């Protein structure tokens, strides 16, 4: 319920946060299941708006 | 000019003030875009609100 309240503008912020965590392998494997549950829920909830965006930078982050 | 937005989700456990409901709405003009708003009356999903301003983002009203 906390993630659903988040606006989409903060979802892009959340995605950037997950991107920055990826470089730190220590943090990623420390909280890998938690990251997955929040990340997949964020994508599922507002998938429609995410796909509509034409930002080339965002496409690279998700890759 | 006033925009029309259809409510897609009635957010819960938002801690809003009594009688105020925080909802997530989708613009009729642009289906992709969504915005979070505060509503005063009884509200459910799929009903349309007239937004006089479309840039402000809802904040918890206590």
């Amino acid at each position: 319920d906390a993630l659903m309240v988040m606006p989409f503008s903060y979802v892009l912020k959340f995605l950037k946060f997950i991107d920055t965590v990826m470089q730190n392998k220590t943090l990623l494997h420390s909280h890998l299941p938690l990251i997955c549950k929040n990340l997949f829920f964020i994508i599922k909830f507002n998938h429609k708006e995410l796909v509509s965006q034409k930002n080339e930078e965002l496409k690279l982050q998700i890759n | 000019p006033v925009t029309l937005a259809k409510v897609i989700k009635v957010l819960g456990r938002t801690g809003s003030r009594g009688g105020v409901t925080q909802v997530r709405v989708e613009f009729l003009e642009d289906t992709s875009r969504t915005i979070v708003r505060n509503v005063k009356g009884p509200v459910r999903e799929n009903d349309i609100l007239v937004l006089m301003e479309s840039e402000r983002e809802a904040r918890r009203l206590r």
Binding site: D1, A2, L3, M4, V5, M6, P7, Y10 | R13, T14, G15, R60
Partner: peptide, 11 residues
């Protein structure tokens, strides 16, 4: 005080 989600946005 702040609730979950509202705290996350601030963070």
């Amino acid at each position: 005080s702040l609730k979950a989600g509202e705290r996350l946005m601030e963070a």
